[PDB]
């Protein structure tokens, strides 16, 4: 409705990626929901480490031949020219990273997966979030999801890696004994 706050309205990119990875690992998300998102993920990676390359000659034809750039080139040492070129390319790279069409597509795919999760488990989608490690990134969690997809949807499934189909026992969780007591320690 655009006025209802989704449960993940405050999550960061790392938190969203970890939620998707945990949902897939816990067999809440099937391998049939990933192939689009995963694809976008790969494109996003190519959209990150290729842009400076794509931006290196283009500027040489568009920006670095302008009057200000030529003035810098002709009236300043070669090291300052290198500094100007590197600073311009790095600023363009940062702007691309913040505002990239493929980054937007990846975020949309993650949002669709989170919407599917909310449609499946309801408000318990918030239970997929945790206190993530500080230096683990959204790309790292996406790569872990891709690795899990390759393990499950490929060879060695059932030999080296757990299968995607769960075989958990059928019990009544209301009456089945639990490991943790409500307040005390039990043995």
């Amino acid at each position: 409705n655009n006025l209802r706050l989704k449960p993940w309205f405050h999550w960061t990119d790392e938190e969203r990626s970890h939620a998707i990875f945990s949902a897939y690992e816990k067999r809440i998300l099937k391998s049939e929901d990933l192939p689009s998102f995963l694809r976008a993920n790969r494109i996003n990676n190519v959209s990150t480490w290729v842009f400076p390359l794509i931006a290196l000659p283009l500027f040489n034809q568009s920006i670095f031949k302008l009057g200000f750039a030529q003035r810098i080139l002709l009236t300043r040492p070669a090291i300052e020219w290198h500094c100007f070129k590197i600073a311009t390319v790095a600023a363009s790279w940062l702007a691309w990273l913040n505002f990239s069409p493929f980054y937007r597509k990846l975020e949309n795919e993650k949002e669709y997966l989170l919407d599917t999760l909310e449609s499946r488990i309801g408000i318990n989608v918030l239970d997929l979030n945790d206190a993530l490690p500080r230096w683990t990134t959204s790309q790292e969690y996406n790569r872990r999801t891709q690795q899990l997809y390759n393990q499950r949807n490929g060879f060695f499934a059932g030999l080296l890696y757990p299968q995607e189909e769960s075989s958990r026992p059928l019990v009544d969780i209301a009456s089945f004994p639990k490991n943790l007591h409500k307040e005390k320690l039990t043995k």
Partner: protein, 50 residues
């Protein structure tokens, strides 16, 4: 030798401070489960002074 004496004294000191929380196991025959119960302790006052 001082390190050895330090470990021995710390071991005894830790035991003494561990006296004052009575932690026991209680069996619940209705639930057939053991639980960890915490309680206070009563002892002769000379023990507390020493």
């Amino acid at each position: 030798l001082l390190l050895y004496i330090l470990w021995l004294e710390f071991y005894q000191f830790y035991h003494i401070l561990s006296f004052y929380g009575n932690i026991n196991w209680a069996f619940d025959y209705d639930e057939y489960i053991w639980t960890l119960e915490l309680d206070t302790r009563r002892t002769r006052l000379a023990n507390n002074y020493i």
